[PDB]
Amino acid sequence: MNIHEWQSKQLIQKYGGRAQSGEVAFSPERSRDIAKKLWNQFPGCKFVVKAQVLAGGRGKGHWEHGMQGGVKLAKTPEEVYEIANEMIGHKLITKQTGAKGINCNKVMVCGALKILKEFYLSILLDRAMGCPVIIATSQGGMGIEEVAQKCPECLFKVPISVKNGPTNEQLVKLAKDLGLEGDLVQDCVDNVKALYQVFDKCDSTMVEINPLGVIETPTDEKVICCLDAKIAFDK
Amino acid sequence: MNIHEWQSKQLIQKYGGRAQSGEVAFSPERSRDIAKKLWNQFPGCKFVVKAQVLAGGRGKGHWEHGMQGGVKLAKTPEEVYEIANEMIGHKLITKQTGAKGINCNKVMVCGALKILKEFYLSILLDRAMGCPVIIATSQGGMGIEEVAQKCPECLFKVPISVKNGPTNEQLVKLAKDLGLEGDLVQDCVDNVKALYQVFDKCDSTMVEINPLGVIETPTDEKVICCLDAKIAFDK
Ligand SMILES: Nc1ncnc2c1ncn2[C@@H]1O[C@H](COP(=O)(O)OP(=O)(O)O)[C@@H](O)[C@H]1O
Numbered sequence: 001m002n003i004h005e006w007q008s009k010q011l012i013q014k015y016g017g018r019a020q021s022g023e024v025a026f027s028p029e030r031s032r033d034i035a036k037k038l039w040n041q042f043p044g045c046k047f048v049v050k051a052q053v054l055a056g057g058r059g060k061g062h063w064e065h066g067m068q069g070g071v072k073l074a075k076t077p078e079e080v081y082e083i084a085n086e087m088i089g090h091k092l093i094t095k096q097t098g099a100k101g102i103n104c105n106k107v108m109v110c111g112a113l114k115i116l117k118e119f120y121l122s123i124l125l126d127r128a129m130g131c132p133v134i135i136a137t138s139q140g141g142m143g144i145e146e147v148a149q150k151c152p153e154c155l156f157k158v159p160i161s162v163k164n165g166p167t168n169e170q171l172v173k174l175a176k177d178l179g180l181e182g183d184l185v186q187d188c189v190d191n192v193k194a195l196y197q198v199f200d201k202c203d204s205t206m207v208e209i210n211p212l213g214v215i216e217t218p219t220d221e222k223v224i225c226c227l228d229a230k231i232a233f234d235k
Numbered sequence: 236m237n238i239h240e241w242q243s244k245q246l247i248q249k250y251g252g253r254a255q256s257g258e259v260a261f262s263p264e265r266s267r268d269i270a271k272k273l274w275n276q277f278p279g280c281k282f283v284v285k286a287q288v289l290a291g292g293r294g295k296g297h298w299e300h301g302m303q304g305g306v307k308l309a310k311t312p313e314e315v316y317e318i319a320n321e322m323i324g325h326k327l328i329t330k331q332t333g334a335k336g337i338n339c340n341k342v343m344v345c346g347a348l349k350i351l352k353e354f355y356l357s358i359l360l361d362r363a364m365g366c367p368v369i370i371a372t373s374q375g376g377m378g379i380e381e382v383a384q385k386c387p388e389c390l391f392k393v394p395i396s397v398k399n400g401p402t403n404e405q406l407v408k409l410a411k412d413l414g415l416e417g418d419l420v421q422d423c424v425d426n427v428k429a430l431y432q433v434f435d436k437c438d439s440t441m442v443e444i445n446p447l448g449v450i451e452t453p454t455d456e457k458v459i460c461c462l463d464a465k466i467a468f469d470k
Pocket residue numbers: 020048055056057058059060071110111112113114115118210211227228229
């Protein structure tokens with residue numbers, strides 16, 4: 001099974017990772033109120049409304065009633081209301097769902113972020129190798145399998161000691177292989193450590209961050225942040 | 236009498252003005268919770284903790300026990316806790332208070348903003364003219380009275396028709412006299428209109444925005460925002 005994005009991000013935050021969990025809403029009225037209250041802190045900010053469904057490919061999916069996209073930018077709380085009203089109580093159709101679509105009864109309302117870089121990072125049990133592995137790449141061709149077949153050099157696989165877990169040396173090297181320098185190296189190290197603790201201590205079969213981002217804070221500091229999150233379990 | 240900053244800013248927002256009302260906290264532990272929850276929306280952002288006291292000169296004031304400043308930057312929720320712990324339940328000393336200081340039992344927790352320009356703008360009851368007047372300047376010499384005496388030409392005065400309120404022509408010119416262009420012109424017009432409706436509909440004796448700011452949103456859009464606010468009434 002999988003848990004929803006906002007819950008996965010909350011779990012990551014509990015273990016010390018930086019992730020935009022936003023706030024969940026079960027009505028367009030609530031979504032509007034969330035956005036309106038956020039304008040008390042960052043007046044004029046834009047918003048993103050993300051359908052919370054147990055399926056991927058939301059950004060490029062489309063709703064049964066016509067609207068395009070499960071991840072949509074909004075300029076105002078009223079636009080947040082309108083967008084959320086087309087998601088909540090309706091059926092989203094993506095690549096992963098097929099024509100059958102998937103029901104949505106809730107969204108995440110978050111602030112729109114300035115994104116400088118997007119990475120893919122996942123942690124799973126690699127049966128072939130017999131150990132957990134951290135997989136990551138800086139390519140933006142979406143499909144992780146697509147990049148793997150068109151550019152094997154683009155994918156970094158880090159085998160993890162089943163017993164001791166990741167070592168600082170492994171994570172520092174991965175951070176530099178992804179092109180990070182300066183404070184972002186240790187920032188990425190700390191975030192991947194948190195992600196591995198989620199994977200390990202929560203008995204997950206996969207922790208997948210697509211994308212793991214370099215973002216700018218409202219005062220332009222560059223930090224690592226999970227922009228999407230999917231955590232799977234065996235039940 | 237006067238009301239607190241956050242109450243004045245909430246009033247401005249009710250009438251359509253853009254103002255950072257933040258969120259008020261009546262205890263240090265609540266101040267921490269507010270900052271921590273804000274990292275769900277703008278992960279990595281810095282914070283500002285503003286003592287809510289009925290006195291000016293907070294920025295340069297100092298607390299009875301040593302801490303400097305009634306408006307303080309903080310990097311983390313725990314720093315917000317530490318700062319709020321020295322403000323809530325303690326005595327702040329500013330120019331306006333004298334050595335007797337003033338008690339503080341609550342703070343505003345705000346997101347740290349990127350501030351590009353700071354203006355002064357006030358709306359007063361002018362008895363010599365028998366009508367309200369808007370006074371504004373782009374100078375940063377703190378003392379409005381100081382700037383007024385050393386550079387009267389730096390101050391722009393706009394008499395207001397009580398029957399019609401500020402006109403688009405008056406406000407467009409004021410916005411350009413303050414150095415604004417592009418979308419900020421209309422932005423400033425709409426905000427000053429709201430400020431006048433506050434002044435008029437709430438029967439205020441003074442609405443003073445020091446500073447009225449040009450800020451950047453988290454995605455770098457330039458918008459007008461009230462960064463401080465003082466609204467006076469007669470008992
Ligand atoms: N807060 C945000 N601000 C701006 N863009 C965002 C934000 N969160 C996500 N995005 C963008 O939206 C895209 C799609 O969202 P995502 O969470 O990856 O869902 P999915 O994989 O189902 O399409 C991301 O690849 C990212 O580029």
